[PDB]
Structures are given as C-alpha cells and as structure tokens.
Nucleic acid binder design. Structure first.
Length: 86
DNA sequence: CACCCTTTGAAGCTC
DNA sequence: GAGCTTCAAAGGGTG
C-alpha cells in the first residue's frame, strides 16, 4: 500500500498533543494548530524532547520490521505541494 | 475534493 | 559525500 514515511518527532508530538489542543482551544485549522505544536515544543524539557528522537527511531525500526527496507517513496511527487524549494 | 498554510525530521531525489 | 525537494500530519480555509 502507500506505506507512509516513518514519521519524525514533531509528527508524534502532534498525534499526542494536537487532539488535546483541538479539545482545549477554539482552533482546528492544522497550519495554525501545528504552529501551536511549535510553541508547545518549548514546554518540553530536554528529556521530553529526547523521548521524541527515541520514539521517532522506534517508529523507524517498526517501519523496517513491518516492511524490510521499504524505501520512503510511496507518494514522492504525487502531491503538488507549495513552497517546494524550502 | 486536492491544494493551501504550517511544523520538524527523515528520506526521498538530485548533484 | 554534499545538497535540494517531497511526504509525512492535517483541518479549516482556499481554490
């Protein structure tokens, strides 16, 4: 199937906190909410931060276990995308 | 109903 | 190895 890229730190931070943000705040609009995740990152102690790099790597390994050598490109260049040359 | 806007990181692609 | 480009999430807002 479209085996998604192995999500990084902030994508998990989103998955966890974003639900809470959306429950707490008036906002839903992902681009604003994601800048909220950006802000919320500043609350993470160095250890809480580190946890994400661990988690990210856990997911990375899960990806490798579920799909031995699944190379990222499940949809590379399918979305047009804005900014592009970030 | 796909892309915009946004965030970081990885990992695609390109050189 | 050094670098540039796209998807991942994601939801109203835009198109």
């Amino acid at each position: 199937m479209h085996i998604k890229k192995p999500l990084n730190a902030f994508m998990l931070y989103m998955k966890e906190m974003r639900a809470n943000v959306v429950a707490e705040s008036t906002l839903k609009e992902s681009a604003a909410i994601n800048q909220i995740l950006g802000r919320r990152w500043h609350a993470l102690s160095r250890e809480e931060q580190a946890k994400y790099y661990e988690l990210a790597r856990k997911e990375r390994q899960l990806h490798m276990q579920l799909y031995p050598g699944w190379s990222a490109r499940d949809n590379y260049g399918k979305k047009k995308k804005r900014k592009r040359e970030k």
